[PDB]
Design a protein around this ligand. Structure first.
Ligand SMILES: *[C@@H]1O[C@H](CO)[C@@H](O[C@@H]2O[C@H](CO)[C@@H](O[C@@H]3O[C@H](CO)[C@@H](O)[C@H](O)[C@@H]3O)[C@H](O)[C@H]2NC(C)=O)[C@H](O)[C@H]1NC(C)=O
Ligand SMILES: *[C@@H]1O[C@H](CO)[C@@H](O[C@@H]2O[C@H](CO)[C@@H](O[C@@H]3O[C@H](CO)[C@@H](O)[C@H](O)[C@@H]3O)[C@H](O)[C@H]2NC(C)=O)[C@H](O)[C@H]1NC(C)=O
Ligand SMILES: *[C@@H]1O[C@H](CO)[C@@H](O[C@@H]2O[C@H](CO)[C@@H](O)[C@H](O)[C@H]2NC(C)=O)[C@H](O)[C@H]1NC(C)=O
Ligand SMILES: *[C@@H]1O[C@H](CO)[C@@H](O[C@@H]2O[C@H](CO)[C@@H](O)[C@H](O)[C@H]2NC(C)=O)[C@H](O)[C@H]1NC(C)=O
Ligand SMILES: *[C@@H]1O[C@H](CO)[C@@H](O[C@@H]2O[C@H](CO)[C@@H](O)[C@H](O)[C@H]2NC(C)=O)[C@H](O)[C@H]1NC(C)=O
Ligand SMILES: CC(=O)N[C@@H]1[C@@H](O)[C@H](O)[C@@H](CO)O[C@H]1O
Ligand SMILES: *[C@@H]1O[C@H](CO)[C@@H](O)[C@H](O)[C@H]1NC(C)=O
Ligand SMILES: *[C@@H]1O[C@H](CO)[C@@H](O)[C@H](O)[C@H]1NC(C)=O
Ligand SMILES: *[C@@H]1O[C@H](CO)[C@@H](O)[C@H](O)[C@H]1NC(C)=O
Ligand SMILES: [Ca+2]
Ligand SMILES: [Ca+2]
Ligand SMILES: [Ca+2]
Ligand SMILES: [Ca+2]
Ligand SMILES: [Ca+2]
Ligand SMILES: [Ca+2]
Ligand SMILES: [Ca+2]
Ligand SMILES: [Mg+2]
Lengths: 915, 4, 683
């Protein structure tokens, strides 16, 4: 919003060094803020792409930066019979730089490590390493948690268990507030994903120059897993820290696994001991869900909110085509124990291949409005594909879908603008957090400074009615009496660190609706309908109020005496900019509008006092809990008094209820303009009833409202209905309260069929007959106490006329038949053969809890008894299987209306061929 | 156990 | 008559033509201040005003070129036509629609070139042995389907970078499997070995000289090879007039875009050919893996069919990928690639059995509704694809093009092309909004108040300030009025509280964020219902407060789609014949049936219940349904064959249907639907 896209500071690095691949703010001891920039391809002393880190001091004009020197010589030591080796060529130093306190932590993800012992070696691989430095004291330290001295032969015999030879530690790094370094190793445990943590103090204390392989005492690493889902998940591709368990003492880690579960993606929230607390599965495969994760409080609730990026998400285009644009997921943290379900918002990029969500950077309170904001990056987005960064402002219920600002890449094409972002630090020290965007393609870093935000507050006060026969003032230069009314226009600008020379232009328009010659009201001073006051509010902590005189034109001049007079106040920054960027950004309600009208047929009293009556009647009384209830709130309005000005129908909707549409019975005005609004703590809908609601006018309004989320409520829900106007005496109608009962109900389908339904038996192993019973929870509410009893004739023995086999509860409802089915492991006019004739084989199928709309199917495997088929080959049999449905109770506060119960019959017709 |  | 043409417009020919397609205009000087100039043609013609001066443009579609569909294929490649007509010209008046039909044929003996892209990991050593003579075996099975067959070979392992590859000891760079006491080639990203050639013996020779290489991580760089094979048209040797099959054989997960960060590669993969004179992927070690979206763009652009010949352990992974890559088929591959020859033939037959249309470069002002005739003569509505076809079958699609208002471009052209077909239909749309009377325009005519306004088309279009029929009433000079028609009815608001009652006519307000129009300024284009924050769901234009939904969409909120492609189920019937289609979604009216396409039901009548009549329809041709066309329209099974009574491999529906002759018809249903009907039942 208030980021300045004109005065940019550009920091440049060596050409082709990828200066800007990663960056962070560094605050030295003196308090000055410097920028730490990583250049993972900076040439080393041997003309090799070792990488480097640059510490850029804050300068208005930017420019070059002095490099932060790190050791870049390949090391080698002989410990006993082994020869530890370190290879720093193409190590990518600076690929991840994080600053904490006075320590700069730059990692080299692709640094190689190798151990030689006799002929056998350790299979030189990119273990990775991270370099720690204190720029003030000059201290240097290193941390390579995945270095080992185990030969490659040992790993083969142990099935590559605890194989950390390819961690690439430092791929993603973050330092907790307590001061514990957390490194992401997407390749650890054979590309399974690894996480390494160690206090920064212990890393410095335990570091010893010339010792390539040491062990930090307090370090803790993640755990290897045999679950195939985690295979090749790159667990640790991105890492973030935050609070997600309600205990401020403990710190929780947010780890992204962009290829978890066969390239599905996932973000895991785990405590300091790596015990998983919650997992957020990706939405689309190969979308790289979890590529970037950010933790911030975007709704001012005091609880951190999780943001996940999916750069390669392909949104379903309107033409049934998939377009790769990227997506950012917002997971607002609910109150109490974490219950993060579906994402609370879905920000989707627009430019194809833009990789929206590639980098997410919390911005703090960019506008100081009380809600934290974020800046999502599209390194290849924008109309020209040069990349852009979008700024989203937090609000009381998450983020705003519309990006408040869009920063376009000032660099050439293919600069990867916005690949790395960082904010929440006031670099220039003007009270507003600033943003720095890295573009390693152009080897430059762009610094965006946040400008002060002015919260303009415009208030226009004017009369409610005009009486032309009350001419008091006289037109200047003449004495022709006219009807004059006062117009008060209070303007107030407030903000933090705003300039003391703040000026505002307040434009007043009288009767803006009509054309210039159609204006009915004019100002006494200029005899014109409109003025532009220049208000300077520098140093003013209270609104500035100005008053003018507006007179009603002569009655014979204008014929329209019914259309309300509309007064507008525009307010805007002065054009003093003269081409330069305005030092401030005007924000808030800068445009107000108020109405006034000529006193028309208000009676001898010259005051319009209306009388308003309302009637409430709801249709669809049963509000089934868990069902998308739609209620028709049929209503009637009567203006039994005089004319009502700006008559509006007020409906107080509960949290579950939502306005859908409102239709009136007036042919000319059948559709009512309803404006949903969240009045103090209860949402309300304002539907117009005609601005000059005529006397003796009755309007019947039928509104459809969607009521949901009734589970977290009582037996009933009520609505507030009132008709409010802008008259002086009796402006509002009596509030009519309408209550609708809330009920929980559900129904279940009991159906089954025979496979085959009929099987002509020509008359042990023989014809195959199986019965399948399926239950569907079609009811709006969930079901609990699922019970089923199937009556199957027979004994599963030679006495049985139809051998039976194992019963399969596909839905998940186990049962026990009365006679033990399949005693042997081997699978060896019709008369109603019910279960009565033989021992009734009844299976106690119980599923207890049944999800809404869920279907459970139980099938029985049976075969006609071959010896029994031969005997009695002249008696047609129709094997009838009967089942009974049963429910304990709906799991709700009030599950009335009995419980679902069914009675279904399934039979198979043998059709004795030799009957 | 793991790999190609 | 109180039609829309007379109510609105009545100001100029230009405005009335945009009122609605049915409106006309009379520029004749007759009827002075009488009947409205704009109305239905019969209304205008009925009241005289017909000196052949009525401007009533009619939308027309002309076939600029339509060669007949070639019936034989092969022969001369240039003359092989699979879509007819090939070019059509559309002239659409404002907010008008015109229907046009096209035909698509799967010509027999159409040339096909198959490019074999085989993963060469160490686990594919067994596979490479069975492929040894796949060139001749593939040729024999294809010569019965195509005269012109050309086969190429390509291999891939992974990026030769520090991870994914063994870089130590130094010997490992030359013999990666040296730690296993074996010899193998050094790792390579993608290696084109044999360009598409008709000499099938070359394929056998090249495969015999190939060898495997060993990498570290399970995922392979397969998608890198697919991109290079698709975009290296000259190197690979694709023929424009031929079916392009890209057999992609692998037995492991595949690296996707953004995986190159492990190797340090961050540059996005551009869809360019980087295969050099050495036939190796030059940018393998310096460019990231392609994304799914990029591959689909290049596969669709090059008209290449991708076949995932993968093994069992990754069949689901590539099946899920195939969902995100439309136009791809997945085939289960044996662990030794022993059934690849049958996999290719089945894949090719499946590819040629379907026709799906795609629209390219469609202007935003146009919408299209497609109806498919497919096999038989049932016109499934809102469907752009026909499945179940065999070679030689012709399907016809009826398309209606509707324009959103009057675009100012006046010349647009889009292409309708079936997926995988070189042939396409080029539609040239020429919008026609202004009328011919505008040519004889008088900027300052003495008729229009001594030339203070422009005269054209038999009426006066007055300039600013001056209003009236002859521009003689000014703007404010006639504030008083006595014959004013500002109020639509007595006692109603003048000009609907949105205009000025000057000179009788209602002059509408500035119409902020919109435009107020009408005899009483009642109509507008900013009052339509917004379904999800967009007026008319962004699938329609507001016309006097009514959402005039364009083609492809319908409903008061223009949010119900007319597309029924979602309903189309593997079964070949809309929503599996168990329900209808409501705005794409399936309504499973059939009891016990559910799913996205009402395809899965476990409590419905068994196959036998109905398949009994399917055999009675063809195997017997008696009783009924034989005259109802069900034996062909509905019965896609086979006629009486035998009763093997041993085909339980997959789909074993044992049915002892009893016929009218009392014979026990033992028929077995057996994912091409096949009915093993008994040759002769026993009574
Ligand atoms: C490939 O196929 C589809 C592509 O979208 C996906 O299959 C689904 O995978 C999920 C995760 O394994 C399955 O989840 C489970 O579903 C049951 C309910 O069916 C639920 O009770 C469990 O808690 C769990 O969520 C899901 O069933 C499965 N769907 C189907 C139709 O099989 C997935 O992306 C891929 N499946 C693979 C790789 O197995
Ligand atoms: C694709 O098929 C559908 C369904 O046949 C076509 O829509 C239907 O087309 C017919 C013929 O134009 C319409 O008939 C009409 O009836 C209405 C009254 O209901 C009348 O006002 C029209 O003048 C006309 O006589 C029918 O309404 C229409 N829709 C439905 C729901 O049946 C569609 O046009 C076909 N598309 C193409 C490109 O051929
Ligand atoms: C749900 O099932 C139970 C049995 O599991 C039913 O209660 C039993 O019903 C039989 C048959 O009437 C009686 O002989 C038992 O004494 C009952 N047991 C009790 C009441 O504990 C029950 O009626 C079924 N559904 C409901 C709630 O009606
Ligand atoms: C657009 O639809 C019309 C029908 O509404 C088609 O006109 C029919 O064309 C066929 C084939 O020539 C004739 O058999 C019919 O007799 C015609 N109309 C009718 C219903 O009698 C028209 O061909 C379609 N599109 C084109 C290409 O103009
Ligand atoms: C198109 O929009 C309409 C609303 O304008 C949707 O109709 C709603 O459907 C749901 C589900 O049946 C009902 O609960 C609502 O009450 C309906 N609203 C109405 C009738 O105003 C309709 O479902 C939408 N269609 C699609 C495909 O989304
Ligand atoms: C084509 C290219 O990259 N040229 C660069 C040039 O822009 C840069 O100023 C210079 C710095 O040494 O290095 C070289
Ligand atoms: C965490 O430490 C603080 C000390 O600052 C202590 O008050 C708190 O109780 C500790 N947490 C728990 C769960 O005890
Ligand atoms: C808002 O509503 C709450 C709940 O009824 C009430 O406690 C509070 O005082 C209200 N705030 C107002 C009226 O400003
Ligand atoms: C049912 O049909 C299948 C397929 O023909 C056959 O394999 C099986 O043996 C049959 N079962 C019988 C005859 O019971
Ligand atoms: Ca905690
Ligand atoms: Ca929060
Ligand atoms: Ca904010
Ligand atoms: Ca700042
Ligand atoms: Ca009064
Ligand atoms: Ca193999
Ligand atoms: Ca690999
Ligand atoms: Mg492999």
């Amino acid at each position: 919003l208030n980021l300045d896209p004109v005065q940019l500071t550009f920091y440049a690095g060596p050409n082709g060094s990828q200066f800007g691949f990663s960056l962070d703010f560094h605050k030295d001891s003196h308090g000055r803020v410097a920028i730490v920039v990583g250049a993972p391809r900076t040439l080393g002393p041997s003309q090799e792409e070792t990488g480097g880190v640059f510490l850029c001091p804050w300068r208005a004009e930017g420019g070059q930066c002095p490099s932060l020197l790190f050791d870049l010589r390949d090391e080698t030591r002989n410990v006993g019979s082994q020869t530890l080796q370190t290879f720093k060529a193409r190590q990518g130093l600076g690929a991840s730089v994080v600053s904490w306190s006075d320590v700069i932590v730059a990692c080299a993800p692709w640094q190689h490590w190798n151990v030689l012992e006799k002929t056998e070696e350790a299979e030189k691989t990119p273990v990775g390493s991270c370099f720690l430095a204190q720029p003030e004291s000059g201290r240097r330290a290193e941390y390579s948690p995945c270095r080992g001295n185990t030969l490659s032969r040992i790993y083969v015999e142990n099935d590559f268990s605890w194989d950390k030879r390819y961690c690439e530690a430092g791929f993603s790094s973050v330092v907790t507030q307590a001061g514990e370094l957390v490194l992401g190793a997407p390749g650890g445990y054979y590309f399974l994903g690894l996480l390494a943590q160690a206090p920064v103090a212990d890393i410095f204390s335990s570091y010893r120059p010339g010792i390539l392989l040491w062990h930090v005492s307090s370090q803790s690493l993640s755990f290897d897993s045999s679950n195939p889902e985690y295979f090749d998940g790159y667990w640790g591709y991105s890492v973030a820290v935050g609070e997600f368990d309600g205990d401020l003492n403990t710190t929780e880690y947010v780890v992204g696994a962009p290829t978890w579960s066969w390239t599905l993606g996932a973000v895991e929230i785990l405590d300091s001991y790596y015990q998983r607390l919650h997992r957020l599965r990706g939405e689309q495969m190969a979308s790289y869900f979890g590529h970037s994760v950010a933790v911030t409080d975007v709704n001012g609730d005091g609880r951190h909110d999780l943001l996940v990026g999916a750069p390669l998400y392909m949104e379903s285009r309107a033409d049934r085509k998939l377009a790769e644009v990227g997506r950012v997921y917002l997971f607002l943290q609910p109150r109490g124990p974490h219950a993060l379900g579906a994402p609370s918002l879905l920000l989707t990029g627009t430019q194809l291949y833009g990789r929206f969500g590639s980098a997410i950077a919390p911005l703090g309170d960019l506008d100081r409005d009380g809600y934290n904001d974020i800046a999502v990056a599209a390194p290849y987005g924008g109309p020209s594909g040069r990349g852009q960064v979008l700024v989203f402002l937090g609000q009381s219920e998450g983020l705003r879908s519309r990006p408040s600002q869009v920063l376009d890449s000032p660099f050439p094409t293919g600069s990867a603008f916005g690949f790395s972002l960082r904010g929440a630090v006031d670099i220039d020290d003007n009270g507003y957090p600033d943003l720095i965007v890295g573009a390693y393609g152009a080897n430059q870093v762009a610094v965006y400074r946040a400008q002060p935000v002015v919260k303009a507050s415009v208030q226009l006060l004017v009369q409610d009615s005009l009486n032309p026969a009350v001419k008091s003032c006289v037109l200047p230069q003449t004495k022709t009496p006219v009807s004059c009314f006062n117009i008060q226009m209070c303007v107030g600008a407030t903000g933090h660190n705003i300039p003391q020379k703040l000026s505002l232009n307040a434009e007043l328009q009288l009767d803006r609706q009509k054309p210039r010659q159609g204006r009915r009201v004019l100002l006494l001073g200029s005899q014109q309908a409109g003025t532009t006051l220049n208000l300077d509010l520098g140093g003013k902590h209270s609104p500035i109020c100005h008053t003018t005189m507006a007179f009603l034109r002569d009655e014979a001049d204008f014929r329209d005496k019914l259309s309300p007079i509309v007064l507008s106040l525009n307010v805007s920054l002065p054009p003093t900019e003269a081409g330069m960027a305005p030092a401030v950004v005007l924000h808030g309600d800068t445009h107000v509008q108020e109405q006034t009208r000529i006193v028309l047929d208000c009676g001898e009293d010259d005051v319009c006092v209306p009388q308003l009556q309302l009637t409430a009647s709801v249709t669809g009384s049963p509000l089934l809990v868990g069902a998308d209830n739609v209620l028709e709130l049929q209503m009637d309005a009567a203006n039994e008094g005089e004319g009502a000005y700006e008559a509006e129908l007020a409906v107080h909707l509960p949290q579950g209820a939502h306005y859908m549409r409102a239709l009136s019975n007036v042919e000319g005005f059948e559709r009512l303009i309803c404006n949903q609004k969240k009045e103090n703590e209860t949402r309300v809908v304002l539907c117009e009833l005609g601005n000059p609601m005529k006397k003796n006018a009755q309007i019947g309004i039928a509104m459809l409202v969607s009521v949901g989320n009734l589970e977290e409520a009582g037996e009933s829900v009520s609505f507030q209905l009132q008709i409010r106007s802008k008259n002086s005496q009796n402006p509002n109608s009596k509030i009519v309260l309408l209550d609708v009962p809330v009920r929980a109900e559900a129904q279940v389908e009991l159906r089954g069929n025979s496979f085959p339904a009929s099987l002509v038996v020509a008359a042990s192993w023989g014809p195959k007959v199986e019965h399948t019973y399926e239950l569907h929870n079609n009811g709006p509410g969930t079901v609990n106490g699922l019970h089923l009893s199937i009556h199957l004739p027979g004994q599963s023995q030679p006495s049985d006329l139809l051998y039976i086999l194992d019963i399969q509860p596909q839905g998940g409802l186990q049962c026990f038949p009365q006679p033990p089915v399949n005693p042997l492991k081997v699978d060896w006019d019709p008369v109603l053969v019910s279960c009565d004739s033989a021992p009734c084989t009844v299976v106690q199928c119980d599923l207890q809890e049944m999800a809404r709309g869920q279907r459970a199917m139980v099938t029985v495997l049976a075969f006609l008894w071959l010896p029994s088929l031969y005997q009695r080959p002249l008696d047609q049999f129709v094997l009838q299987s009967h089942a009974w449905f049963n429910v304990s109770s709906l799991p709700y506060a009030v599950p009335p209306l009995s419980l679902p119960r069914g009675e279904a019959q399934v039979w198979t017709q043998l059709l004795r061929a030799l009957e | 156990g793991r790999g190609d | 008559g109180p039609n829309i043409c007379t109510t609105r417009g009545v100001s100029s020919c230009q405005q009335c033509l945009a009122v609605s397609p049915m409106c006309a205009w009379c520029s004749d000087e007759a009827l002075p201040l009488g009947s409205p100039r704009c109305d239905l043609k019969e209304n205008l013609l009925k009241d005289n005003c017909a000196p052949e001066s009525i401007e009533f443009p009619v939308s027309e579609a002309r076939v600029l070129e339509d060669r007949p569909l070639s019936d034989k294929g092969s022969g001369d490649s240039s003359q092989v036509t699979q879509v007819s007509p090939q070019r059509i010209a559309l002239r659409l008046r404002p907010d008008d629609s015109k229907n046009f039909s096209i035909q698509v044929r799967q010509v027999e003996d159409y040339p096909v070139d198959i490019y074999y892209l085989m993963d060469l990991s160490y686990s594919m050593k067994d596979d490479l042995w069975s492929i040894q003579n796949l060139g001749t075996k593939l040729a024999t099975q294809m010569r019965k389907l195509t005269s012109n067959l050309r086969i190429g070979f390509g291999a891939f392992v992974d990026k030769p970078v520090s991870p994914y590859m063994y870089i130590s000891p130094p010997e490992a760079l030359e013999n990666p499997c040296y730690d296993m006491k074996t010899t193998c080639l050094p790792m390579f990203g993608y290696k084109h070995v044999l360009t598409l050639t008709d000499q099938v013996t070359r394929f056998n020779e090249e495969v015999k000289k190939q060898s495997v290489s060993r990498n570290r991580d399970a995922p392979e760089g397969g998608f890198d090879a697919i991109m290079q094979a698709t975009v290296c048209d000259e190197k690979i040797g694709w023929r424009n007039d031929a079916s392009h099959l890209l057999v992609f054989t692998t037995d492991a997960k595949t690296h996707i875009a953004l995986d190159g960060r492990l190797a340090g590669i961050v540059q996005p993969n551009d869809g360019q050919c980087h295969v050099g004179s050495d036939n190796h992927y030059s940018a393998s070690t310096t460019m990231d893996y392609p994304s799914l979206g990029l591959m689909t763009e290049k596969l669709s652009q090059k008209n290449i069919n991708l076949i995932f010949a993968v093994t069992e352990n990754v069949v689901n992974l590539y099946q899920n990928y195939s969902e995100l890559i439309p136009g791809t088929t997945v085939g289960v591959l044996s662990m030794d690639s022993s059934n690849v020859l049958q996999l290719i033939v089945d894949a090719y037959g499946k590819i040629r059995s379907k026709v799906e249309l795609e629209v390219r470069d469609l202007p935003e002002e146009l919408s299209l509704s497609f109806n498919a005739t497919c096999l038989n003569n049932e016109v499934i509505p809102g469907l752009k694809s026909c499945m179940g076809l065999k070679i030689g079958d012709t399907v016809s699609f009826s398309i209606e093009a509707k324009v959103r208002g009057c675009p100012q471009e006046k010349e647009k052209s889009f292409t309708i092309k079936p997926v995988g077909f070189k042939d396409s239909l080029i539609v040239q749309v020429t919008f026609d909004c202004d009328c011919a009377c505008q040519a004889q325009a008088e900027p300052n005519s003495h008729r229009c108040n001594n030339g203070n306004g422009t005269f054209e088309c038999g009426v006066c279009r007055c300039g600013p300030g001056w209003l009236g029929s002859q521009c003689e009433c000014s703007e404010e000079d006639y504030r008083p009025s006595q014959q004013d028609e500002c109020s639509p009815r007595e006692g109603q608001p003048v000009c609907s509280q949105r205009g000025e009652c000057l000179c009788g006519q209602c002059v509408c307000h500035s119409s902020d964020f919109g435009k107020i129009t009408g005899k009483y300024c009642e109509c507008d284009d900013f009052s339509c219902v917004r379904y999800k924050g967009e007026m008319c769901s962004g699938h329609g234009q507001c016309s006097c407060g009514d959402c005039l939904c364009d083609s492809d969409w319908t409903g008061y909120y223009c949010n119900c789609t007319t597309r029924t492609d979602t309903c189309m189920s593997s079964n070949g019937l809309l929503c599996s014949g168990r329900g209808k289609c409501e705005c794409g979604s399936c309504v499973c009216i059939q009891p016990g049936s559910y799913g996205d396409t009402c395809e899965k039901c476990p409590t419905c009548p068994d196959a036998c219940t109905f398949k009994k009549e399917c055999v009675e329809c063809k195997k017997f041709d008696r009783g009924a349904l034989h005259d109802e066309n069900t034996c062909n329209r509905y019965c896609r099974d086979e006629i009486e064959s035998v009763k093997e009574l041993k085909d339980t491999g997959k789909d074993a529906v044992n049915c002892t249907y009893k016929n009218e002759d009392d014979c026990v018809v033992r028929f077995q249903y057996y994912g091409k639907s096949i009915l093993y009907v008994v040759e002769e039942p026993e009574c």
